Amino acid sequence: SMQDPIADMLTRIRNGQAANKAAVTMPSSKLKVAIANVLKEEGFIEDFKVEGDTKPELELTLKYFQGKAVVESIQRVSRPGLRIYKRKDELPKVMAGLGIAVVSTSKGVMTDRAARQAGLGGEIICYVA
Amino acid sequence: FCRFTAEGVQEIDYKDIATLKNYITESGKIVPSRITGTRAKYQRQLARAIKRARYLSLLPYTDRHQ
Amino acid sequence: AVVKCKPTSPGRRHVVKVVNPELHKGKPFAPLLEKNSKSGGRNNNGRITTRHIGGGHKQAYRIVDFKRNKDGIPAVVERLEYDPNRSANIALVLYKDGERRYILAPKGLKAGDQIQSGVDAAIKPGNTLPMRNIPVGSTVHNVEMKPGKGGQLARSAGTYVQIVARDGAYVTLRLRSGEMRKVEADCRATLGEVGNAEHMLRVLGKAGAARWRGVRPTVRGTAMNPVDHPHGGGEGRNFGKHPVTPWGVQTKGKKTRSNKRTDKFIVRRRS
Amino acid sequence: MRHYEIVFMVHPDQSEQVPGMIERYTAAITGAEGKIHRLEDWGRRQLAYPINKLHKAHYVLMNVEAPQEVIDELETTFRFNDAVIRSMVMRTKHAVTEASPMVK
Amino acid sequence: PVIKVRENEPFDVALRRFKRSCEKAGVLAEVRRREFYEKPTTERKRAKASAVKRHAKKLARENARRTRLY
Amino acid sequence: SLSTEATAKIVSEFGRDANDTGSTEVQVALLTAQINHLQGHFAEHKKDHHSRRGLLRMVSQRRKLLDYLKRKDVARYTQLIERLGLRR
RNA sequence: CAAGCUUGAGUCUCGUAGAGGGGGGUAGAAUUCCAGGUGUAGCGGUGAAAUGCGUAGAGAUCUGGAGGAAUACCGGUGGCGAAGGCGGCCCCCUGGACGAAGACUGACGCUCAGGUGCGAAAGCGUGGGGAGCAAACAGGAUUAGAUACCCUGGUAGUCCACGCCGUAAACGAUGUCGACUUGGAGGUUGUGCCCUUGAGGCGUGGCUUCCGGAGCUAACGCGUUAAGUCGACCGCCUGGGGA
RNA sequence: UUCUUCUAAAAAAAA
Secondary structure: OOOOHHHHHHHHHHHHHHOOOOEEEEEOOHHHHHHHHHHHHOOOOOEEEEEOOOOOEEEEEOOEEOOEEOOOOEEEOOEOOEOOEEOHHHOOOHHHHOOEEEEEEOOEEEEHHHHHHOOOOEEEEEEEO | OOHHHHHOOOOOOOOOHHHHHHHEOOOOOEOOHHHHOOOHHHHHHHHHHHHHHHHOOOOOOOOOOO | OEEEOOOOOOOOOOOEEEOOOOEOOOOOOHHHEEEOOOOOOEOOOOOEOOOOEOOOOOOEEEOEOOOOOOEOOOEEEEEEEOOOOOOOOEEEEEEOOOOEEEEEOEOOOOOOOEEOEOOOOOOOOOOEEEOOOOOOOOEEEOEEOOOOOOEEEOOOOOOOEEEEEEEOOEEEEEOOOOOEEEEEOOOEEEEOOEOOHHHHHOEOOOHHHHHOOOEOOOOOHHHOOOOOOOOOOOOOOOOOOOOEOOOOOEOOOOOOOOOOOOHHHEEEOOO | OEEEEEEEEEOHHHOOOHHHHHHHHHHHHHHOOOEEEEEEEEEEEEEEEEEOOEEEEEEEEEEEEEOHHHHHHHHHHHHHOOOEEEEEEEEEOOOOOOOOOOOO | OOOOOOOOOOHHHHHHHHHHHHHHHOOHHHHHHOOOOOOHHHHHHHHHHHHHHHHHHHHHHHHHOOOOOO | OOOHHHHHHHHHHHOOOOOOOOOHHHHHHHHHHHHHHHHHHHHHOOOOHHHHHHHHHHHHHHHHHHHHHHHHOHHHHHHHHHHHOOOO
């Protein structure tokens, strides 16, 4: 059965980039739209949009620069089989700080650098670079 | 080029000996589907009808059994 | 239903009973009982004419209807009963006019079933008709040898015969021994096999079980002395001769049928 | 109930007994609250191969709707009737009533 | 395969017609097939191999139809 | 399988709205009815394993539904097992 | 923890295809045996022979009868089943799958150590049945030898009822469930629209075969039915021999 | 149509 919608979202993004798709569509969720918002303000996806009322569908407009895809490595970190939680002083720097790590803190979900600035840790949802 | 799908007949009737004789050889054997061009579903129905007729002694099993 | 006894003692360790829950758990029908006195295997001259018989539990004779002549009058089966006189079980049936009789029990007979004899009876297990109206290939039992004499063939626990052919006034039956025999088409017979088919599966377990049925022990010929049997004698175990009966006739293969009167009805001998 | 198509072949020497056999079987069916949707005596016909060392047989077709508890005993009556040579009892999805292709 | 010789017909053409009828009806192949016992695994493998060849030859012809040899 | 009339009768007896055909009580009743109807069949044909697999599928499905019902509303579960005579 | 929602999962109405399973009948071809008619010196078998079958009449041919097993043609990298596996026809009981329109319950779901059930063929027990085939065995050949390959016979077994055994290269050498990622030619099975202006055209589902793009792979290859990109659970591996 | 087997020691280049 489908037991990890966030991983499914990351997988749709990765496959669409590999297959040179302009946009991808998936069933929405408040956490998916939140990660999508983080990616848009960090310049990984062009724009996100959610339509529908009873079964809302989120559509992500992918981004391409110089022919090739922008996101070249995206992976789920805390997966249902093994959860990962890290304190603020030991947060990881993905690709020496050039990449980002989507971390879910108490004050919403934000990037690792923002979490370090704000001084609080949380659950590490995924790395994206 | 299946005659049964052309007429759009629901099911092949085993009592229709006149049409059934056109799909058997002189030896009494069944002519293959790839030769006569009949569709597979009607071919199975046709086979069932031919066997039912043979049981009912309306058609010969072989050309030699007397 | 066969059940295996638990080994709580030797003599019971190997017993396998054949229980039948349908049999009457009471006394047999009084107007049909009659005396059956033992003989000890001794004829009217008082000499033992067949050894290893004697003793055993007392038994009474049940008058079983073998002739089956009540034609046209249907009968309902009152109950199944055990019969010590034969291997098969018997059934107490009640005719419409109020006469009760004993018949052999077929394979599928249960309490409440309807049976009938005669030329116009239905073809179903337990009915008795003359075998010229009975379809060829059918397995029948309690079959007569002469018209009106009563059943003599296929009478044990789980036996039957097959009517394999019919040619004019005679039919050819495949007897239970594997032998093809002719018989007249006017003899009656009952449809279907006879009931207690699992009777051969039982094992007696101990010597006393065979003693209860009036079967005295059997002494092997080689264990005797030369005056008693041809095989007797020898310092040790010696058997240097061809096996023969106590009166000198060979047993291992030698045929003994000498009835030329009935040879004309045996189409083919057993195998 | 269930729809059955019965077709039986009876010995040609009993060709005069076939009306009476038709009456008895139809009487049984109706008495068992059944319907007879079609009944076509095809009469005698030449067999494609000799059955029981005879080369002709009297065919009869009958389309009936009846309970299986009367249909099975009808099969037994066929089994025990020596006059009838064969009988095919096929079960069909719906009642069919059109004339068979061997009446023309 | 019954062949009844018609009036004003040579024996040799009658024999040829009988031979043609026989190879049409497939009696020689059937008897040679049933001469010895063939295991279910062997006949399945043989039919599978036959289908593979019957498809491969068609594809091979299709590829060969494009290119030239000189 | 079950007859159309039998299913109609069962859904009328157990359905809250008489047209639903999907409620847990109705589904459990249908499965129970089919199992009891198949009791006679498997008593005669003891070697029909291919149908016994489907029967076990029905049994496991009914077990899961009863567990779900007992977790959701104990009262309906109790009433249903009382009406159907199920020991657990 | 409480209240929900319908997309996952399931139920109902109308149908469709199928060697899916269990029980009971029945039809035809052929092999063997038995009895009879015709007929005479060979038959059978092999690379060549011989054992064997024949003047006590074989083989061949015709007629009648008995018995057991399996269903030519259809038949198809065709169909159904979770796997093992299932092939004449008819009836009874019965499981699963798929399609079109809705309606309904409302996460009820996926996997599963231990446990339970099913599980080819051979084998075992009890009781039947035994035509053909055929471990063991005997005889005849080949050979230096031939406890084999080849030939003539032939017993357990193969068949039926009920239990036991629980193993296979039990294989797709690829565990189950779900999501995403270019395509082509077919097979099989529903179903919607356009004039079915004939067997026409345009879609949309289920199962399945071959080729191939990116990608993966030690390579061969796999390639929307993945061995690609991911998530959940289980079983298993740590040099070869010993094992 | 049959046609078996050959034990036990080698050497190889390095801009």
